[PDB]
Amino acid sequence: SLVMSSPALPAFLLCSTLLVIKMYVVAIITGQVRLRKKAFANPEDALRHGGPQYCRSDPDVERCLRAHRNDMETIYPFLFLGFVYSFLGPNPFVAWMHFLVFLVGRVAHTVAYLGKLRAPIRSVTYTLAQLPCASMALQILWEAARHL
Amino acid sequence: SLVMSSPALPAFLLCSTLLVIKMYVVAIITGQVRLRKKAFANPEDALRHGGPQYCRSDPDVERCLRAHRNDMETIYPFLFLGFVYSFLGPNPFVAWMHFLVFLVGRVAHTVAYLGKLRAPIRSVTYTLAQLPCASMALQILWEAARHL
Amino acid sequence: SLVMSSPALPAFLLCSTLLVIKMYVVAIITGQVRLRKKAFANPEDALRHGGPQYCRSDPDVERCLRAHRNDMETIYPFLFLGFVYSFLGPNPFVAWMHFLVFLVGRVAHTVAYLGKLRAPIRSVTYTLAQLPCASMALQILWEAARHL
Numbered sequence: 155s156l157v158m159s160s161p162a163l164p165a166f167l168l169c170s171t172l173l174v175i176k177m178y179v180v181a182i183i184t185g186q187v188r189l190r191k192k193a194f195a196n197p198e199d200a201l202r203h204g205g206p207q208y209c210r211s212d213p214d215v216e217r218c219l220r221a222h223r224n225d226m227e228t229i230y231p232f233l234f235l236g237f238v239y240s241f242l243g244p245n246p247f248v249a250w251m252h253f254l255v256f257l258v259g260r261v262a263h264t265v266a267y268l269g270k271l272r273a274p275i276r277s278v279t280y281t282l283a284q285l286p287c288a289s290m291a292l293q294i295l296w297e298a299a300r301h302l
Numbered sequence: 303s304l305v306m307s308s309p310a311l312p313a314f315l316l317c318s319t320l321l322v323i324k325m326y327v328v329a330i331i332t333g334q335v336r337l338r339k340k341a342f343a344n345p346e347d348a349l350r351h352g353g354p355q356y357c358r359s360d361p362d363v364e365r366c367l368r369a370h371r372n373d374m375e376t377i378y379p380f381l382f383l384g385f386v387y388s389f390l391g392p393n394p395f396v397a398w399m400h401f402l403v404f405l406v407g408r409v410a411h412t413v414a415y416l417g418k419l420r421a422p423i424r425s426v427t428y429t430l431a432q433l434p435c436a437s438m439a440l441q442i443l444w445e446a447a448r449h450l
Numbered sequence: 451s452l453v454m455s456s457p458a459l460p461a462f463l464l465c466s467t468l469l470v471i472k473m474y475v476v477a478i479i480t481g482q483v484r485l486r487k488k489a490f491a492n493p494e495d496a497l498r499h500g501g502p503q504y505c506r507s508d509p510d511v512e513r514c515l516r517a518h519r520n521d522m523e524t525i526y527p528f529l530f531l532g533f534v535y536s537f538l539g540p541n542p543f544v545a546w547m548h549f550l551v552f553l554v555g556r557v558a559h560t561v562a563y564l565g566k567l568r569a570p571i572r573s574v575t576y577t578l579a580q581l582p583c584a585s586m587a588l589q590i591l592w593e594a595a596r597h598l
């Protein structure tokens with residue numbers, strides 16, 4: 155199997171795939187919040203679910219959308235960076251640590267966001283998860299530059 | 303050519319690339335709607351195209367933006383998942399089916415969204431396209447976990 | 451090192467990684483603008499930083515968010531397209547030109563957006579950066595189709 159191409163790759167693919175599933179969960183939650191609070195973005199949805207007055211914003215829906223958007227701002231770059239990084243032959247334990255800190259930080263971020271935890275808990279989880287991304291980005295820069 | 307690295311890869315790259323082009327089309331449509339309805343997000347744009355009163359929101363522009371955002375929530379994870387999945391040696395016909403259901407589901411989603419089709423047509427196309435993504439995600443999880 | 455898998459790959463990884471770092475910079479700027487203008491998206495953030503009245507929108511914050519979102523609409527597809535394209539054996543100089551035009555166009559786009567430059571400067575930088583993406587997309591389509 156091509157998951158054996160590099161020692162860090164299986165750990166990367168496990169953590170990345172879990173985070174994609176975590177984003178799908180946020181999408182599902184968002185939909186459930188829309189249905190339960192009757193707050194739809196489109197008139198066609200609202201008219202199916204009670205009438206035109208349910209085409210409206212809602213603070214819990216907006217919060218879900220922000221959590222999902224922040225995921226797209228951070229998890230998507232990790233998908234790219236962590237994949238490339240997996241092929242630069244980093245120490246396997248060190249790679250594991252980058253991926254684990256990102257995974258735990260991002261899961262905690264979503265819990266802190268949707269659970270409305272006090273500041274600066276969410277902000278800290280964001281920063282902690284960004285550290286391994288910044289680290290991987292720099293390492294890729296050096297490897298790319300030196301092969302020019 | 304490295305498109306021969308796995309039997310499912312050419313089908314994946316065809317479907318993914320078509321969907322990226324489909325997102326570019328949504329961007330172009332969004333711009334056309336802004337120009338035609340004179341609804342710009344920035345004062346600098348509005349002042350070039352008729353005056354400061356054209357810095358305003360518009361429901362058709364907002365609809366285009368939602369379609370584009372939903373694309374980013376679903377097509378981007380597919381780009382990652384479908385690529386990795388292509389290298390796990392799935393049955394070629396089964397892989398084709400995952401990619402085709404995603405492609406047709408997503409194209410139909412954009413048509414349903416921008417064409418303002420009645421509920422739950424859009425919601426159904428979303429769910430149908432998510433099925434192959436969920437399937438690929440699970441398969442990747444198993445392959446990654448077993449190589450740890 | 452696997453950065454030697456194709457002659458265009460190091461140039462791609464340099465430009466892509468710089469653009470990911472450029473998006474992180476936009477995130478950091480956005481946070482600084484929120485703190486300095488006291489415009490927070492969440493009540494929990496606002497209550498930590500002066501009171502509930504600082505849970506409010508702000509035009510500079512909204513501008514930062516639009517710049518970041520436009521990045522996600524354009525840089526993320528480039529991450530996918532430029533990676534695949536790097537493996538299709540394009541002329542190395544021609545590949546360099548695609549990646550450089552995208553890099554310069556996107557950096558200029560963010561400068562034009564956040565610096566509030568007059569129209570159509572931002573719009574031109576967007577279009578110029580989309581050209582190499584469109585070109586790569588087409589080339590991938592042809593390579594994928596011909597291997598079906």
Ligand SMILES: Cc1[nH]c(NC(=O)c2cc(CNC(=O)C(C)C)cnc2C(F)F)nc1-c1ccc(C(F)(F)F)cc1
Pocket residue numbers: 181182184185186188189194198199200202203421422423425426429430
């Ligand atoms: C019957 C139905 N209704 C709806 N949806 C709605 O009424 C709806 C839901 C939401 C909230 N969003 C979500 O929760 C997402 C995460 C799914 C928003 N707007 C609407 C609007 F469309 F009314 N879907 C199905 C469905 C049917 C068959 C399948 C299948 F045949 F595939 F099994 C699948 C789905």
Ligand SMILES: Cc1[nH]c(NC(=O)c2cc(CNC(=O)C(C)C)cnc2C(F)F)nc1-c1ccc(C(F)(F)F)cc1
Pocket residue numbers: 329330332333334336337342346347348350351569570571573574577578
């Ligand atoms: C002359 C011009 N104007 C504008 N744009 C605007 O006036 C404009 C447009 C929109 C809508 N967005 C779109 O439709 C997107 C999808 C392109 C929004 N805001 C503005 C604002 F800038 F006014 N662009 C060019 C252009 C020129 C040369 C090239 C080149 F030299 F590359 F050929 C390219 C473009």
Ligand SMILES: Cc1[nH]c(NC(=O)c2cc(CNC(=O)C(C)C)cnc2C(F)F)nc1-c1ccc(C(F)(F)F)cc1
Pocket residue numbers: 273274275277278281282477478480481482484485490494495496498499
């Ligand atoms: C003490 C603190 N405060 C905050 N954040 C806030 O008070 C805050 C900031 C913003 C603006 N966003 C940003 O600027 C982003 C780009 C970071 C918005 N909302 C809040 C809200 F949480 F109040 N963070 C830390 C922090 C502590 C330790 C670490 C560590 F231990 F990791 F060193 C890291 C961070």
Ligand SMILES: CCCCCCCCO[C@@H]1O[C@H](CO)[C@@H](O)[C@H](O)[C@H]1O
Pocket residue numbers: 176179180264265268269270
């Ligand atoms: C990956 C998905 C994780 C989902 C996190 C769920 C957090 C829900 O947490 C709950 O949220 C409620 C409303 O915000 C609060 O009233 C409750 O105090 C809190 O327990």
Ligand SMILES: CCCCCCCCO[C@@H]1O[C@H](CO)[C@@H](O)[C@H](O)[C@H]1O
Pocket residue numbers: 285288289290292293
């Ligand atoms: C604001 C504080 C800066 C945090 C940056 C954390 C990124 C550290 O990243 C580190 O950078 C080193 C130098 O490039 C590399 O040699 C290491 O491999 C890398 O882990």
Ligand SMILES: CCCCCCCCO[C@@H]1O[C@H](CO)[C@@H](O)[C@H](O)[C@H]1O
Pocket residue numbers: 324327328412413416417418
């Ligand atoms: C990939 C791009 C697909 C674009 C889908 C275009 C759907 C347009 O469809 C049209 O939309 C109009 C306004 O919404 C409606 O008034 C019309 O009834 C409908 O035909």
Ligand SMILES: CCCCCCCCO[C@@H]1O[C@H](CO)[C@@H](O)[C@H](O)[C@H]1O
Pocket residue numbers: 433436437438440441
């Ligand atoms: C809410 C209903 C759940 C829909 C989940 C659809 C995903 C099915 O996905 C399937 O999962 C199996 C078990 O992991 C795998 O063996 C299959 O290869 C995979 O196609």
Ligand SMILES: CCCCCCCCO[C@@H]1O[C@H](CO)[C@@H](O)[C@H](O)[C@H]1O
Pocket residue numbers: 472475476560561564565566
């Ligand atoms: C990659 C990050 C690039 C950041 C671009 C910074 C552009 C800031 O540019 C400044 O913006 C101010 C407010 O918009 C204006 O008042 C100033 O005229 C302008 O110099």
Ligand SMILES: CCCCCCCCO[C@@H]1O[C@H](CO)[C@@H](O)[C@H](O)[C@H]1O
Pocket residue numbers: 581584585586588589
């Ligand atoms: C609106 C004007 C259209 C701009 C499209 C620019 C994309 C050009 O892209 C070019 O397409 C050719 C034909 O497929 C390929 O042979 C070239 O390799 C490719 O660079």
Ligand SMILES: N[C@@H](CCC(=O)N[C@@H](CS)C(=O)NCC(=O)O)C(=O)O
Pocket residue numbers: 220221223224227276277278280281477478480481491515518
């Ligand atoms: N787009 C972000 C940029 C900065 C950022 O990502 N901040 C983290 C830590 S405060 C966050 O959780 N932001 C909340 C969000 O994106 O909604 C924002 O507007 O806050």
Ligand SMILES: N[C@@H](CCC(=O)N[C@@H](CS)C(=O)NCC(=O)O)C(=O)O
Pocket residue numbers: 181182184185195219222368369371372375424425426428429
């Ligand atoms: N961000 C989505 C999460 C759920 C989702 O993706 N739902 C599908 C099926 S109803 C959809 O088309 N949503 C419309 C949208 O994203 O604007 C939302 O707010 O609706």
Ligand SMILES: N[C@@H](CCC(=O)N[C@@H](CS)C(=O)NCC(=O)O)C(=O)O
Pocket residue numbers: 329330332333343367370516517519520523572573574576577
């Ligand atoms: N989502 C975009 C689609 C079109 C686009 O990307 N346009 C470029 C050139 S005008 C841009 O810079 N848009 C500003 C933005 O995305 O906020 C929009 O609403 O404008």
